[PDB]
């Protein structure tokens, strides 16, 4: 088989600036016809891969003039001119010279935008859920940058540990921020013992930690 | 215009056969093109599995070639993937494609002995200007759920977080939306949760507490 290699797992870029994504093939993709059989794909968060470039250098229909492909028989470059927020996702090269067709491992485009503080929100367990004997308390951090944040759960001012899970969205296609949920899980019995449930967020965009809380 | 849509069970037991259907709309599969199955493993690596061509001819990745069949039924404009003797290595998102240009939305297949389980959907109630509300979608298996808001009419300001597999072996996520806090009294907000593997749709109204 032909092995397709993308050396960088991700590449940083400031929006408006340019970026290059590189690919190598273990065998020349130039056929005996002058065409080089290398495709480029973008997979945006939540979507299927989409064709960008075909035959190494040919822009596919609807793809902006900002994307261009260049290269030799074995070493290829996708150049993105003036990167926009909408360009985030994973870029994959694929050879279509010989079956089996094979892909590079992909390169994520990370947009390095400006600092943005999270809007924090706290949600108590619903009454419907409390019936089943479990309480989920949710802390939401919306549209922040950079990705790093510290979320701390405090119950009756006693710092929690071991009893929460976080999830973070992919970089957003529109504003290049992240959002995060932290779900605190306790039994109903353990929930009813306490009064003040608080979520304390630490982040670079916050001159002081934001705490959101509720009384049971 | 031409569209491809995968269907199939989200769950297959270890050592059993996986069968997926690609339904092609607005195109005759006997007319032209090569019709591919491509899969994406957790961790995001892509593998081309094989095709059936317009003329019923086959080519399969030597990776699978003993276990794979790609067939078709032009009377329904569908082509099929069969993969025998699945292991945990076969857990992936399966895409059907027309050439490189037209891709289905993908179907997740999880290789597991466990049964399907539909989600519980709980409101995340707004506790101004704008406010966040949402739905906690808990205790389902396997992936995925899809979440829409007010039947597809509210799409601006929506975040549906990646699922996390809990210690119980069931998945959980939240979907949240940012909303005018003046419309909290008069506007109805319902999260539409679809869990295909269990054929369960849940509609939950999220009301201020
Ligand atoms: Ca693996």
XYZ file of C-alpha atoms and ligand atoms in Angstrom:
426
model
C 0.000 0.000 0.000
C 0.925 3.671 -0.230
C 1.476 5.199 3.218
C 0.321 8.823 3.646
C 1.996 10.851 6.378
C 1.095 14.148 8.031
C 3.959 14.998 10.398
C 2.165 17.696 12.433
C -0.949 16.517 14.378
C -1.985 20.188 14.569
C -0.856 23.653 13.384
C -1.410 27.023 15.135
C -2.451 30.146 13.226
C -3.575 33.704 14.007
C -6.763 34.517 12.044
C -6.066 36.641 8.943
C -2.563 35.133 8.688
C -1.551 32.171 6.452
C -0.847 28.542 7.304
C 0.578 25.485 5.577
C -0.448 21.873 6.119
C 2.014 19.266 4.890
C 1.681 15.683 3.683
C 4.130 13.050 2.396
C 3.534 9.882 0.360
C 5.704 6.729 0.530
C 5.522 6.496 -3.267
C 5.224 9.106 -6.034
C 1.636 10.129 -6.771
C 2.532 11.352 -10.252
C 0.908 8.985 -12.791
C 2.079 8.373 -16.397
C -0.332 11.151 -17.443
C 1.088 14.240 -15.688
C -1.638 14.360 -13.012
C -0.704 13.844 -9.358
C -3.434 11.939 -7.494
C -3.561 13.707 -4.107
C -6.866 14.899 -2.554
C -7.218 17.281 0.431
C -10.189 17.094 2.834
C -11.490 19.243 5.645
C -13.515 17.737 8.433
C -15.205 20.504 10.427
C -16.466 19.626 13.917
C -19.536 17.331 13.803
C -19.440 16.936 9.998
C -18.310 14.399 7.367
C -15.045 15.018 5.538
C -15.401 17.419 2.567
C -13.283 17.558 -0.575
C -11.189 20.730 -0.946
C -8.441 20.049 -3.490
C -8.174 17.317 -6.139
C -5.201 16.103 -8.252
C -2.717 17.948 -5.902
C -3.500 21.515 -7.090
C -7.102 21.696 -8.452
C -9.635 23.720 -6.406
C -12.945 21.782 -6.153
C -16.191 23.736 -6.801
C -17.328 26.099 -4.022
C -13.955 26.025 -2.216
C -12.633 29.645 -1.813
C -9.524 30.945 -3.624
C -7.833 31.015 -0.161
C -7.041 27.261 -0.381
C -4.296 26.115 -2.738
C -2.305 22.935 -3.149
C 1.271 22.522 -4.269
C 3.974 19.883 -4.173
C 6.238 17.387 -5.870
C 5.529 13.699 -6.470
C 5.876 12.811 -2.791
C 5.686 16.025 -0.697
C 2.540 18.143 -0.659
C 1.353 21.391 0.901
C -2.142 22.772 1.401
C -1.808 26.533 1.776
C -4.591 28.429 3.482
C -4.389 32.118 2.753
C -5.895 34.514 5.320
C -7.371 31.913 7.700
C -10.928 32.545 8.916
C -12.735 31.114 12.003
C -14.719 28.831 9.650
C -11.489 27.088 8.588
C -11.130 25.154 11.897
C -11.230 21.355 11.839
C -9.003 18.532 10.701
C -7.249 18.472 7.325
C -6.584 15.088 5.698
C -4.632 14.245 2.549
C -5.632 11.156 0.576
C -3.911 9.426 -2.355
C -6.156 8.053 -5.108
C -3.347 6.651 -7.300
C -3.785 2.988 -6.386
C -6.248 0.829 -4.430
C -6.413 0.674 -1.467
C -6.874 4.438 -1.173
C -5.188 5.705 1.983
C -5.342 8.828 4.141
C -2.826 10.768 6.181
C -3.462 10.822 9.951
C -4.827 14.365 9.717
C -3.789 17.812 10.900
C -6.036 19.929 13.129
C -6.057 23.665 12.493
C -6.011 25.509 15.810
C -7.056 29.159 15.595
C -4.995 31.204 18.056
C -7.468 34.046 18.729
C -7.600 36.657 21.496
C -8.504 36.027 25.152
C -12.223 35.667 25.917
C -13.653 35.131 29.415
C -16.304 32.455 30.005
C -19.907 33.268 30.804
C -20.584 30.920 33.734
C -23.963 29.343 34.555
C -25.118 26.878 37.254
C -28.029 24.436 37.061
C -29.624 22.480 39.935
C -30.847 18.860 39.491
C -34.380 18.726 38.065
C -37.281 17.416 40.169
C -37.833 14.677 37.556
C -34.288 13.371 38.131
C -34.422 13.543 41.946
C -37.105 10.791 41.795
C -34.524 8.242 40.562
C -32.186 8.758 43.559
C -29.403 10.634 41.720
C -28.692 14.368 41.513
C -26.718 15.895 38.640
C -25.590 19.469 39.197
C -24.291 21.139 35.969
C -21.807 23.993 35.631
C -21.557 25.603 32.221
C -18.667 27.751 30.908
C -19.544 29.383 27.580
C -17.366 30.691 24.747
C -13.980 31.195 26.400
C -10.365 31.237 25.118
C -7.781 29.833 25.693
C -8.937 26.255 26.367
C -7.427 25.927 29.860
C -9.780 26.511 32.784
C -10.050 25.233 36.342
C -13.567 24.343 37.526
C -14.050 23.671 41.231
C -17.170 22.364 42.906
C -17.936 23.576 46.430
C -20.762 22.042 48.518
C -21.451 23.934 51.790
C -18.066 25.606 51.120
C -16.366 22.176 51.243
C -14.204 21.678 48.128
C -15.229 18.573 46.077
C -13.015 15.931 44.480
C -13.503 12.700 42.497
C -17.246 13.173 41.870
C -17.386 15.224 38.621
C -16.830 14.874 34.851
C -15.968 17.582 32.322
C -16.597 17.771 28.619
C -15.230 20.423 26.228
C -16.428 21.309 22.715
C -14.151 21.446 19.693
C -13.005 24.916 18.710
C -16.089 26.734 17.424
C -16.403 27.308 13.641
C -17.760 30.867 14.172
C -15.863 32.538 17.049
C -13.010 30.010 17.632
C -13.818 29.708 21.366
C -14.369 26.704 23.611
C -17.238 25.787 25.883
C -17.122 23.390 28.841
C -19.621 21.524 31.027
C -18.838 20.125 34.462
C -21.375 17.677 35.841
C -21.354 16.954 39.593
C -22.923 13.578 40.423
C -24.202 12.692 43.921
C -26.906 10.387 45.314
C -30.237 12.043 46.239
C -29.489 11.292 49.924
C -26.114 13.076 49.680
C -27.749 15.999 47.795
C -30.424 16.650 50.487
C -27.780 16.848 53.279
C -26.350 20.143 51.980
C -27.497 23.657 50.996
C -24.942 25.728 49.056
C -23.837 24.201 45.739
C -21.216 26.370 44.072
C -19.111 26.259 40.912
C -15.843 28.271 41.052
C -14.173 28.999 37.698
C -10.558 30.107 37.225
C -9.498 31.421 33.793
C -6.970 33.795 32.171
C -9.771 36.194 31.130
C -10.981 36.567 34.708
C -9.084 39.007 36.942
C -10.769 37.181 39.820
C -12.493 33.730 39.970
C -16.217 33.748 39.075
C -18.435 31.742 41.440
C -21.996 30.818 40.619
C -24.110 29.138 43.288
C -27.653 28.241 44.358
C -29.462 27.275 47.566
C -31.152 23.856 47.469
C -29.286 17.146 -5.499
C -27.747 13.717 -4.808
C -27.543 12.706 -1.159
C -26.338 9.636 0.663
C -27.766 8.413 3.940
C -26.412 5.542 6.043
C -28.706 3.382 8.130
C -28.115 0.305 10.257
C -27.969 -0.820 13.904
C -25.700 1.227 16.188
C -24.778 -1.957 18.002
C -23.372 -5.281 16.771
C -22.346 -8.181 19.055
C -18.734 -9.401 18.992
C -18.247 -12.181 16.369
C -21.494 -11.327 14.574
C -22.059 -9.618 11.222
C -22.393 -5.869 10.690
C -24.814 -4.766 7.951
C -25.244 -1.146 6.890
C -27.369 0.400 4.162
C -26.562 3.467 2.123
C -29.686 5.047 0.626
C -28.911 7.214 -2.368
C -31.465 9.904 -3.217
C -31.774 11.787 -6.530
C -29.405 9.448 -8.427
C -29.418 6.080 -10.128
C -26.614 3.909 -8.704
C -26.271 1.969 -11.989
C -25.636 5.204 -13.976
C -22.078 6.197 -13.020
C -19.549 6.657 -10.200
C -17.857 4.337 -7.686
C -19.768 3.824 -4.445
C -17.472 3.561 -1.397
C -17.538 2.585 2.251
C -15.026 4.529 4.372
C -14.741 4.311 8.170
C -13.291 6.542 10.849
C -11.948 4.960 14.052
C -12.128 6.584 17.494
C -9.052 8.784 17.424
C -10.057 9.898 13.930
C -7.994 7.781 11.543
C -9.721 7.132 8.196
C -9.725 3.798 6.349
C -11.073 3.152 2.829
C -12.877 -0.233 2.973
C -14.004 -0.919 -0.612
C -16.413 0.038 -3.383
C -19.095 -1.230 -5.667
C -18.873 0.491 -9.032
C -21.743 1.609 -11.287
C -21.287 -1.744 -13.128
C -21.523 -3.974 -10.013
C -17.750 -4.588 -9.976
C -16.001 -4.774 -6.542
C -12.650 -3.712 -5.062
C -11.891 -4.312 -1.344
C -9.103 -3.236 0.955
C -6.822 -6.308 1.459
C -7.144 -5.281 5.190
C -10.630 -6.804 5.279
C -11.073 -8.663 1.951
C -12.075 -12.017 3.461
C -14.675 -10.407 5.814
C -16.194 -7.728 3.577
C -18.962 -7.783 0.993
C -20.357 -4.744 -0.806
C -23.597 -5.452 -2.661
C -26.491 -3.377 -4.035
C -30.189 -3.306 -4.903
C -30.747 -0.830 -7.769
C -34.539 -1.341 -7.428
C -34.168 0.724 -4.219
C -31.036 2.796 -5.106
C -29.243 1.302 -2.108
C -25.875 -0.292 -1.620
C -24.815 -2.343 1.365
C -21.805 -3.097 3.527
C -21.500 -6.504 5.163
C -18.642 -7.114 7.575
C -18.393 -10.569 9.159
C -16.906 -11.631 12.498
C -16.622 -8.118 13.958
C -14.346 -7.362 16.887
C -13.861 -4.231 19.035
C -11.404 -3.171 16.298
C -14.451 -2.558 14.052
C -16.057 0.047 16.301
C -16.077 3.182 14.137
C -18.097 5.784 12.273
C -19.089 4.304 8.897
C -19.512 6.640 5.894
C -20.869 5.810 2.467
C -19.605 8.007 -0.392
C -19.978 8.742 -4.093
C -16.378 9.060 -5.289
C -14.567 11.548 -3.039
C -17.074 14.357 -3.445
C -20.340 13.187 -1.863
C -20.414 11.764 1.662
C -23.161 10.485 3.885
C -23.460 11.954 7.387
C -21.947 8.744 8.812
C -23.318 6.048 11.062
C -21.679 5.056 14.354
C -21.308 1.306 14.941
C -20.298 0.089 18.419
C -19.212 -3.535 18.803
C -20.560 -4.664 22.211
C -22.540 -7.414 24.020
C -24.599 -4.783 25.918
C -28.208 -3.882 25.010
C -29.363 -0.562 23.691
C -30.716 1.938 26.227
C -32.568 5.163 25.459
C -31.712 8.412 27.263
C -33.337 10.138 30.198
C -33.740 13.843 29.317
C -33.817 16.329 32.210
C -34.252 20.129 31.930
C -31.408 22.510 32.753
C -33.632 25.364 33.936
C -32.653 29.070 33.722
C -31.910 30.146 37.326
C -30.371 39.741 32.728
C -30.362 40.192 28.937
C -29.445 36.697 27.747
C -29.740 33.409 29.695
C -28.586 29.836 29.174
C -30.932 26.882 29.307
C -30.479 23.299 28.196
C -31.102 19.567 28.514
C -29.101 16.952 30.359
C -29.249 13.751 28.261
C -28.204 10.945 30.558
C -27.791 7.135 30.649
C -27.945 6.012 27.058
C -26.087 3.427 25.003
C -24.485 3.293 22.501
C -23.657 6.623 20.853
C -24.885 8.863 19.420
C -27.735 11.124 20.443
C -28.594 14.144 18.309
C -30.143 17.200 19.946
C -32.077 19.958 18.179
C -34.010 22.854 19.683
C -37.612 23.844 18.829
C -37.631 21.344 15.922
C -34.660 22.915 14.105
C -35.810 26.543 14.354
C -33.281 27.473 17.069
C -29.704 26.759 15.940
C -27.874 29.970 16.854
C -26.072 29.805 20.219
C -26.415 26.012 20.660
C -23.706 23.906 22.282
C -24.108 20.138 22.444
C -21.123 18.790 24.337
C -19.282 15.598 23.454
C -20.692 12.587 25.314
C -18.736 11.196 28.218
C -18.893 7.454 28.988
C -19.710 7.159 32.724
C -18.346 4.454 35.067
C -21.708 2.709 34.657
C -20.899 2.131 30.958
C -23.648 4.483 29.814
C -23.093 7.807 28.066
C -24.193 11.289 29.135
C -24.081 14.767 27.579
C -25.691 18.195 27.917
C -27.047 20.461 25.216
C -27.329 24.157 26.096
C -28.631 27.264 24.296
C -28.306 31.025 24.926
C -31.669 32.714 24.858
C -33.252 36.197 25.454
C -34.214 36.363 29.147
C -37.336 38.416 28.268
C -38.711 35.538 26.160
C -38.567 33.160 29.168
C -42.232 33.828 30.020
C -43.758 33.650 26.539
C -41.417 31.591 24.349
C -41.515 27.790 24.475
C -38.147 26.016 24.507
C -38.153 22.273 23.792
C -35.033 20.136 23.222
C -35.536 17.397 20.631
C -33.389 14.404 21.493
C -32.991 11.583 18.974
C -31.378 8.261 19.935
C -31.421 6.222 16.713
C -29.940 2.987 18.137
C -32.981 2.558 20.375
C -35.433 4.319 17.989
C -36.291 6.743 20.811
C -37.202 10.402 20.354
C -37.620 12.481 23.506
C -39.136 15.985 23.563
C -38.529 17.926 26.771
C -39.878 21.402 27.516
C -37.410 23.483 29.506
C -39.332 25.914 31.708
C -37.962 28.495 34.195
C -38.035 27.102 37.753
Ca -8.117 1.781 18.439
